[PDB]
mmCIF file of C-alpha atoms and ligand atoms in Angstrom:
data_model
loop_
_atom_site.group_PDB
_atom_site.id
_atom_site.type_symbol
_atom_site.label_atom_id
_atom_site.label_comp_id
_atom_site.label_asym_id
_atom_site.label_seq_id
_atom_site.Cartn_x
_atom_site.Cartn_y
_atom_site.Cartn_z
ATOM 1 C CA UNK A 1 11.637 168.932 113.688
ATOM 2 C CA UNK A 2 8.291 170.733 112.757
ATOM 3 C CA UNK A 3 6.571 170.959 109.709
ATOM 4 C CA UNK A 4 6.180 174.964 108.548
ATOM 5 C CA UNK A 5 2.985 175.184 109.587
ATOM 6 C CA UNK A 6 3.548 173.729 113.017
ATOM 7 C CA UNK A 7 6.493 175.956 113.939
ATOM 8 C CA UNK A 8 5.894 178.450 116.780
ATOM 9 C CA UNK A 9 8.743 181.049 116.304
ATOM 10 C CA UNK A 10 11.844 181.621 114.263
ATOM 11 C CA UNK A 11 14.206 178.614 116.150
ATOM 12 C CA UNK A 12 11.841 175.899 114.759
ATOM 13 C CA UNK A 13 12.267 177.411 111.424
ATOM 14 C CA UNK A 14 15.928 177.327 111.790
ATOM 15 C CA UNK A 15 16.281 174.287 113.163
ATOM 16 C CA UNK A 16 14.683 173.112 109.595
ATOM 17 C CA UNK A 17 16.556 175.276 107.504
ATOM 18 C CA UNK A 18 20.025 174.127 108.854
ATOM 19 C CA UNK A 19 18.862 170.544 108.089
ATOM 20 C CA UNK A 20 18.309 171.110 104.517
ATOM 21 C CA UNK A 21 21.328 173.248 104.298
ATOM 22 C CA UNK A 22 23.231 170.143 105.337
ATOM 23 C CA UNK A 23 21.502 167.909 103.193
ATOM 24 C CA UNK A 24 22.344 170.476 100.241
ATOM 25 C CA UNK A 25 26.057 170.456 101.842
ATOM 26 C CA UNK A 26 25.629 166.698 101.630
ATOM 27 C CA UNK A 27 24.279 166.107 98.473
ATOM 28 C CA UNK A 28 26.988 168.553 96.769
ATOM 29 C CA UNK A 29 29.630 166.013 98.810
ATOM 30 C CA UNK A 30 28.426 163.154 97.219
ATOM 31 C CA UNK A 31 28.282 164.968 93.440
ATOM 32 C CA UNK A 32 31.977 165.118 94.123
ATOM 33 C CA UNK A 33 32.243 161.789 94.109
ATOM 34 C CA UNK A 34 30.614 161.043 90.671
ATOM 35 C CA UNK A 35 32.308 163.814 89.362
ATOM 36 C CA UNK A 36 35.831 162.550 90.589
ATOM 37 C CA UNK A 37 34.329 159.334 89.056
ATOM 38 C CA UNK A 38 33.340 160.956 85.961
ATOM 39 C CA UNK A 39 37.476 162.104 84.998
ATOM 40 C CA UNK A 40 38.093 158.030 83.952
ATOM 41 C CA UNK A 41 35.897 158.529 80.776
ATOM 42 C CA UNK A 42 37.648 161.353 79.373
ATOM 43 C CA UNK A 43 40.601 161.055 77.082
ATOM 44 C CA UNK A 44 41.748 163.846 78.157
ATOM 45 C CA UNK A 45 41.639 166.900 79.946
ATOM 46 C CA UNK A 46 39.603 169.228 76.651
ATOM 47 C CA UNK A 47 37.225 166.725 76.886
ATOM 48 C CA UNK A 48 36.091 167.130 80.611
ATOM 49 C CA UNK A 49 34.073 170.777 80.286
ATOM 50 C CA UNK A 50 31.612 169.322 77.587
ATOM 51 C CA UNK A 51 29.659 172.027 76.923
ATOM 52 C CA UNK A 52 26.957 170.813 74.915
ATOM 53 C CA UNK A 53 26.142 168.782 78.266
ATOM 54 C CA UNK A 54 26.222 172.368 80.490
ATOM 55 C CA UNK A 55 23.978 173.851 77.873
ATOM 56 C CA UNK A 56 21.357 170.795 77.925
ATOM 57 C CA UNK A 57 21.554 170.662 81.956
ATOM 58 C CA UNK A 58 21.022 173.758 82.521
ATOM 59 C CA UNK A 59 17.123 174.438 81.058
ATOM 60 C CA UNK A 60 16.787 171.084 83.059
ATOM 61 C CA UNK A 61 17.434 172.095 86.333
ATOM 62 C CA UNK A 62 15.327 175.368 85.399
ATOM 63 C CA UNK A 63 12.658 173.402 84.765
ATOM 64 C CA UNK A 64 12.896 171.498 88.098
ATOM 65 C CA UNK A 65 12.914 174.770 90.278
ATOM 66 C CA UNK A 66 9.439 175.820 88.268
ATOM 67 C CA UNK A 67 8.329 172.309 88.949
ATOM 68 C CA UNK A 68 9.504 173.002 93.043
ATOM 69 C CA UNK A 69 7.339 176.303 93.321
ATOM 70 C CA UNK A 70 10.732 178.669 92.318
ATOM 71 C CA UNK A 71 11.822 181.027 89.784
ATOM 72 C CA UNK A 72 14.008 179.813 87.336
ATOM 73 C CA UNK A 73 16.609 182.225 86.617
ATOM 74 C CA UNK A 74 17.985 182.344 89.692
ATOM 75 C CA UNK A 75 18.590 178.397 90.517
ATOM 76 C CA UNK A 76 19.330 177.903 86.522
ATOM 77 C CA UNK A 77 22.323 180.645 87.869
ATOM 78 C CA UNK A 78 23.210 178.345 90.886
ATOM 79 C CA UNK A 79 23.416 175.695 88.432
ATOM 80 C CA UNK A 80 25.807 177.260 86.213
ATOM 81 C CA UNK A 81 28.101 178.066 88.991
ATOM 82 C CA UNK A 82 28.263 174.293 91.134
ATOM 83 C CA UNK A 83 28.887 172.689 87.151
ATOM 84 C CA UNK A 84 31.655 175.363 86.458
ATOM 85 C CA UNK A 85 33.533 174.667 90.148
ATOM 86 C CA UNK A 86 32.994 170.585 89.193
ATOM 87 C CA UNK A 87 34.360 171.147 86.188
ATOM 88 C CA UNK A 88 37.407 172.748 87.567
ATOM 89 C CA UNK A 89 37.882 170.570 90.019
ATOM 90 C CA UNK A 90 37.260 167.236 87.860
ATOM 91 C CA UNK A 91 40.412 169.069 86.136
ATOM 92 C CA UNK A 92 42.317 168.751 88.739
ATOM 93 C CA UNK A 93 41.268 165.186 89.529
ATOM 94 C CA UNK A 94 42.350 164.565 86.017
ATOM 95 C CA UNK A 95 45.662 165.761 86.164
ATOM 96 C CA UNK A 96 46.541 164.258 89.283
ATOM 97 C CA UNK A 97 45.560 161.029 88.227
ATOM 98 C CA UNK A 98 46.487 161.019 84.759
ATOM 99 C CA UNK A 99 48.809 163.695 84.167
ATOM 100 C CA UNK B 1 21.327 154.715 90.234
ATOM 101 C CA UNK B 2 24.687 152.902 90.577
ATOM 102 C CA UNK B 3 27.439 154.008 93.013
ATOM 103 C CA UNK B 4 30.597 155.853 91.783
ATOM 104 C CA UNK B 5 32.615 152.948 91.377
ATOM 105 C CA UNK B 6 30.021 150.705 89.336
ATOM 106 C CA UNK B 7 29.660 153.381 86.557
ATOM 107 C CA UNK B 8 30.392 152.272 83.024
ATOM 108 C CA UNK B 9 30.098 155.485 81.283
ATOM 109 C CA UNK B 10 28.983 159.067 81.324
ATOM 110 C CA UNK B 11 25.620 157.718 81.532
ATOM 111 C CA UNK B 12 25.716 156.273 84.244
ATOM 112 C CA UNK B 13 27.742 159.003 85.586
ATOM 113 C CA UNK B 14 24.603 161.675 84.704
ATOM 114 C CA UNK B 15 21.986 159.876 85.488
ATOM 115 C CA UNK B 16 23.856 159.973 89.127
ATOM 116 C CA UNK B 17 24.449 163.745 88.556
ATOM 117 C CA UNK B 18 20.461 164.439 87.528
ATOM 118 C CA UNK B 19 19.330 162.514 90.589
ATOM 119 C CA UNK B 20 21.797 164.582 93.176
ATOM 120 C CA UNK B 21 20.777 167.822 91.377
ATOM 121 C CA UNK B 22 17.189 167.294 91.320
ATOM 122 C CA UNK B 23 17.229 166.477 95.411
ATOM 123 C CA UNK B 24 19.267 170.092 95.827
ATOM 124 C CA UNK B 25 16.611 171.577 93.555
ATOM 125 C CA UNK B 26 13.640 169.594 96.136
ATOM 126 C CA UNK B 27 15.483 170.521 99.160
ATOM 127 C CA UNK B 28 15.513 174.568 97.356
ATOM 128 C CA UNK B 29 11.940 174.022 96.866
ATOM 129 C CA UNK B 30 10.995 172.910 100.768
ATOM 130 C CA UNK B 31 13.271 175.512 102.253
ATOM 131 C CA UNK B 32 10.952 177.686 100.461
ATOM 132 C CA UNK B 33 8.139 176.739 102.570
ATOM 133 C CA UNK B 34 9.999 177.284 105.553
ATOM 134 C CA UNK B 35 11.701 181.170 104.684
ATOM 135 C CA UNK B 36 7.894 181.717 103.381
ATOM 136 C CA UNK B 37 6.616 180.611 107.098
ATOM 137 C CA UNK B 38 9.217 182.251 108.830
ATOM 138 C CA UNK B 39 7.709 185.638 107.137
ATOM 139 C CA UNK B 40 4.992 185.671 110.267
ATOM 140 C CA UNK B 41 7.056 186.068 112.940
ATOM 141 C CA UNK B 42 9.235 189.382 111.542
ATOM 142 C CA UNK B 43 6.631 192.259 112.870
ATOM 143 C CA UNK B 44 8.189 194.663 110.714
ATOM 144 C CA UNK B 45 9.999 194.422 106.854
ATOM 145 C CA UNK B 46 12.608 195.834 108.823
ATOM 146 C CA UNK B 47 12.893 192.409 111.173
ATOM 147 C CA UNK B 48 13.828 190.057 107.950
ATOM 148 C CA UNK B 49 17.014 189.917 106.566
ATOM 149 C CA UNK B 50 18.039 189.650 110.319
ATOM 150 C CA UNK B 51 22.254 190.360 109.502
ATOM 151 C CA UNK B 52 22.923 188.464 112.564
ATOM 152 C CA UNK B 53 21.323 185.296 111.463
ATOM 153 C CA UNK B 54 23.475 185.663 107.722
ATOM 154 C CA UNK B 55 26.861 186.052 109.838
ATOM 155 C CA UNK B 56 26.229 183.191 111.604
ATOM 156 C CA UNK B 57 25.088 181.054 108.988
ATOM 157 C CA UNK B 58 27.611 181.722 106.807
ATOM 158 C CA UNK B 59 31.254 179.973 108.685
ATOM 159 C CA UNK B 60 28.813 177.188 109.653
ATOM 160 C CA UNK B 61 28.309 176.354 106.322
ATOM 161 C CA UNK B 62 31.656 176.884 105.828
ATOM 162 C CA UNK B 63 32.458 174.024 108.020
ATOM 163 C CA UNK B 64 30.132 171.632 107.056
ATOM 164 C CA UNK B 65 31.630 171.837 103.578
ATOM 165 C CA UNK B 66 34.920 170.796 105.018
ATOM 166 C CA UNK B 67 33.498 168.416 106.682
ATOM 167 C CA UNK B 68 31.946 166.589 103.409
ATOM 168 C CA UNK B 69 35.429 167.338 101.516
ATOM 169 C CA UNK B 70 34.547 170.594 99.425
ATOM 170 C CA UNK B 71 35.778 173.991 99.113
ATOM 171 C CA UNK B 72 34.784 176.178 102.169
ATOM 172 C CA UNK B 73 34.933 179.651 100.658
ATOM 173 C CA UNK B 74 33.206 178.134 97.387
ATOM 174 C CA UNK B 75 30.142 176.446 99.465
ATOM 175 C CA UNK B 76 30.374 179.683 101.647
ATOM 176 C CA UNK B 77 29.781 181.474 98.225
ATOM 177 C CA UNK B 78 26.948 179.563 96.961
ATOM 178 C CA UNK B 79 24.808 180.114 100.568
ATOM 179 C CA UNK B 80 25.404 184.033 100.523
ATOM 180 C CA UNK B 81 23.694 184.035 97.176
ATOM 181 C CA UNK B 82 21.204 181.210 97.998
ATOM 182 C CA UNK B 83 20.500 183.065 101.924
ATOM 183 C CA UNK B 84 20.156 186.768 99.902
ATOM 184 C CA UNK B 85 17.523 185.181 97.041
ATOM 185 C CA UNK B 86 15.505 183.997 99.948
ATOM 186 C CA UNK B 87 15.308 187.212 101.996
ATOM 187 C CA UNK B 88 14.431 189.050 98.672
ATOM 188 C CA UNK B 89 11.929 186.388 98.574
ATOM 189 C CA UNK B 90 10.293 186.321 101.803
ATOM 190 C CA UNK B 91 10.152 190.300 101.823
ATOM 191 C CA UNK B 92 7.888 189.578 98.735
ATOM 192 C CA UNK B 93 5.577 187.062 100.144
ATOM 193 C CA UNK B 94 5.606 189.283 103.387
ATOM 194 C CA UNK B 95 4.196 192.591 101.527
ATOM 195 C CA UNK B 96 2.285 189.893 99.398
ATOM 196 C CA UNK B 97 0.217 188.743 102.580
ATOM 197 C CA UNK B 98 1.358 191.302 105.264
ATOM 198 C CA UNK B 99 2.499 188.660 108.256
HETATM 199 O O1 SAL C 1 29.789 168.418 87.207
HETATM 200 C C1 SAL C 1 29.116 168.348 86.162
HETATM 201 O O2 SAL C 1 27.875 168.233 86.189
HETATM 202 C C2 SAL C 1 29.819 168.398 84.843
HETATM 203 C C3 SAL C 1 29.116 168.676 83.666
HETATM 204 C C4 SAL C 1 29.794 168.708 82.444
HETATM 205 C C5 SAL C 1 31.177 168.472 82.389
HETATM 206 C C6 SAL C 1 31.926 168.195 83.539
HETATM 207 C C7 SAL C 1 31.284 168.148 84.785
HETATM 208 O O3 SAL C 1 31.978 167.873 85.933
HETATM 209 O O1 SAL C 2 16.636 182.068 104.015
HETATM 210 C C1 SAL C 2 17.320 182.230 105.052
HETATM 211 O O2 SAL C 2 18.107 181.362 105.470
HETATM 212 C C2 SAL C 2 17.195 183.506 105.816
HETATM 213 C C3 SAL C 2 18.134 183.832 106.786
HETATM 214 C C4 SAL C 2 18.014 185.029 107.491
HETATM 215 C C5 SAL C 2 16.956 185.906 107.229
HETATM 216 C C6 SAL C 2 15.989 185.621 106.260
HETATM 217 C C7 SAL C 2 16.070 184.441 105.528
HETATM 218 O O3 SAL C 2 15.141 184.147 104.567
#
């Protein structure tokens, strides 16, 4: 596993590339969790989308990618689709564990 | 952070959530470095988006999403946008610095 600079043709790069990919594969696995997690402190299943919460997370992870060297509108649009497909499926947690 | 199971509250739950999110936005903002590197070994524009290299990305990501219990064609979804942002990207930084 090379560094960028030390990579001597496109397979090193790749071989980095599909690391992170699986780390972002990963990571998303593990949100699942927490979100599954998250369906116990909602009374029920209108309170689960909370959008004030979207709208405040979602300037926060634009801010992040500016602070990573990347423009913001773009991961800020990522954003807004993984918390829409945890929502959904937090949902469906919900009403197969409470109804 | 506390594990899924130790959480008291949506607190707990987000401060969980921020952590995950912010190492997705970190691992964004190091795959950068790579797709920016990988700009000096295409000899040509032409030689970047490399179609063969998207097609075989894609089902492999597909897979590893199964494999961490999520949503194949919804993880496949994300990485078509995420792989597309970066070409645009690198084709930038490649006319930007002419590798
Ligand atoms: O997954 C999230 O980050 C989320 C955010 C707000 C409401 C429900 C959720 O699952
Ligand atoms: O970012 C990528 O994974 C990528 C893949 C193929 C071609 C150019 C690229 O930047």
């Amino acid at each position: 596993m090379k560094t960028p600079e030390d990579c001597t043709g496109l397979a090193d790069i790749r071989e980095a590339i599909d690391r992170i990919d699986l780390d972002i594969v990963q990571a998303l696995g593990r949100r699942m969790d927490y979100v599954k997690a998250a369906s116990r402190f909602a009374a029920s299943e209108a309170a689960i989308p909370a959008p004030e919460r979207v709208a405040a997370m979602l300037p926060e992870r634009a801010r992040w990618a500016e602070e990573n060297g990347l423009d913001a509108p773009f991961v800020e649009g990522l954003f807004a689709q993984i918390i829409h497909w945890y929502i959904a499926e937090q949902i469906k947690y919900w009403r197969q564990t409470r109804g």
